[PDB]
Design a protein around this ligand. Structure first.
Ligand SMILES: C#CCCC1(CCCCCCCCC(=O)SCCNC(=O)CCNC(=O)[C@@H](O)C(C)(C)COP(=O)(O)OP(=O)(O)OC[C@H]2O[C@@H](n3cnc4c(N)ncnc43)[C@H](O)[C@@H]2OP(=O)(O)O)N=N1
Ligand SMILES: [Mg+2]
Length: 355
């Protein structure tokens, strides 16, 4: 196995043992001003997702050519316009004559805590090449050009996930699923096993509100220190990523008999082509047991009509997946850093959830 493009990139070699910490290459004092050359008849673009026509072009490309997942426009705005987003980081390739969008990659900024270091980075998602254009080395140009546009802004490290093995994962996660609506998945013995309570068990559970932004921010910031790869969110970012939006993101806080918010659970919405799936986001416990929190999360997903509840095995999730009758799925989710060498880690030390 030899990686034509990735072996030229500042990332560790597959199977080299890493005992050191830091950048493979130094920050750059001068960066290429010019966009990388594309084949004749194609052009670069910085998509402005605030224009609804542009947003709908992105939406069309992703549903027809991405990983079937049904990313909504509202969902894309949540994922791709967090604080600090830039339109040039919504990097597209268009046919010159028709302006047809045929390629995409995106970067959003994040402060990333990796072992004893915190570095300003970008997260990379939604790399997509039109089906009629696959296997033509278009992906390496998108990666190089988004790298160039990120460098112009003074950032030299990135974090991302992918289902394929590349040099070199800092960690590997397995996807697990919990059947909420067994009928759509498909006998009476099976439907009975997965019956969940109609109402949650934990006292003081309620939707997150505007007033909970500070305490949710504080609870998440102190919970994440026990992991080795985590985001460091401002209060503005906590608002964007957790404030509830129908069919996008759900957050429930635990407010106790004294009125203290001590726990919260969160999951985002991604339907499949329909099949409505919930994805475990961040779940923070300081007084409610984690097994009760997640049990209530399953109940809340069923009440809201989700057919399936998905969770990775990262953070502390192994302590409850089997007990709540999750089933392991096929494939793996790999975590990668770009231009950062460090020792790899077990799933349970990863504290970063990327959609
Ligand atoms: C500061 C700073 C730097 C910031 C930074 C950080 C680096 C970022 C890296 C990209 C991260 C992406 C995260 C995601 O979003 S995960 C979603 C991607 N999946 C899908 O969306 C499913 C639908 N799929 C398609 O649309 C696909 O067909 C894609 C993947 C687009 C087009 O590929 P093609 O099939 O067209 O093949 P190719 O264009 O010929 O190129 C072949 C070379 O690409 C490598 N390849 C392949 N699959 C890769 C992958 N998933 N990720 C990275 N490489 C990948 C191969 O391994 C070859 O490389 P080598 O082995 O070394 O030779 N720079 N940004
Ligand atoms: Mg290609």
């Amino acid at each position: 196995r030899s990686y034509q493009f990735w072996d030229t990139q500042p990332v560790p070699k597959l199977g080299e043992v890493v005992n050191t910490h830091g950048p493979v290459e130094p920050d750059k004092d001068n960066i290429r001003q010019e966009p990388y050359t594309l084949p004749q008849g194609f052009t670069w673009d910085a998509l402005d997702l605030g224009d609804r026509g542009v947003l709908k072009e992105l939406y069309t490309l992703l549903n027809e050519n991405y990983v079937r997942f049904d990313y909504s426009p509202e969902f894309l705005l949540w994922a791709l316009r967090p604080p600090g987003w830039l339109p040039q980081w919504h990097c597209g390739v268009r046919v010159v004559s028709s302006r047809k969008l045929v390629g995409f990659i995106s970067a959003i900024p994040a402060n990333i805590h990796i072992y004893d270091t915190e570095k300003k980075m970008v997260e990379i998602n939604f790399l997509c090449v039109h089906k009629k254009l696959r296997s033509k080395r278009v992906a390496p140009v998108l990666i190089r050009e988004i790298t160039r546009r990120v460098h112009l802004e003074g950032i030299f490290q990135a974090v991302y996930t992918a289902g394929v093995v590349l040099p070199k994962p800092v960690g590997t996660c397995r996807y697990w699923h919990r059947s909420l609506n067994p009928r759509k998945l498909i006998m009476q013995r099976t439907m009975k096993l997965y019956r969940l309570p109609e109402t949650p068990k934990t006292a003081g559970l309620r939707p997150m509100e505007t007033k909970d932004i500070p305490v949710v921010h504080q609870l998440l910031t102190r919970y994440l220190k026990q992991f080795h790869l985590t985001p460091v969110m401002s209060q503005e970012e906590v608002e964007h990523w957790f404030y509830p939006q129908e069919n996008i993101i759900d957050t429930f806080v635990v407010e106790n008999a004294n009125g203290e918010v001590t726990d919260f659970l969160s999951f985002y919405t991604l339907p499949s082509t329909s099949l409505k799936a919930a994805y475990s986001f961040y779940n923070v416990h300081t007084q409610t047991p984690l097994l009760d929190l997640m049990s209530d999360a399953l109940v809340l997903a069923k009440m809201k009509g989700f057919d399936v509840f998905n969770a990775l095995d990262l953070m502390e999730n192994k302590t409850f997946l089997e007990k709540l009758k999750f089933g392991i799925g096929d494939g793996n989710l790999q975590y990668y850093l770009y231009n950062w060498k460090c020792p790899s880690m077990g799933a349970e030390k990863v504290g970063l959830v990327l959609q």
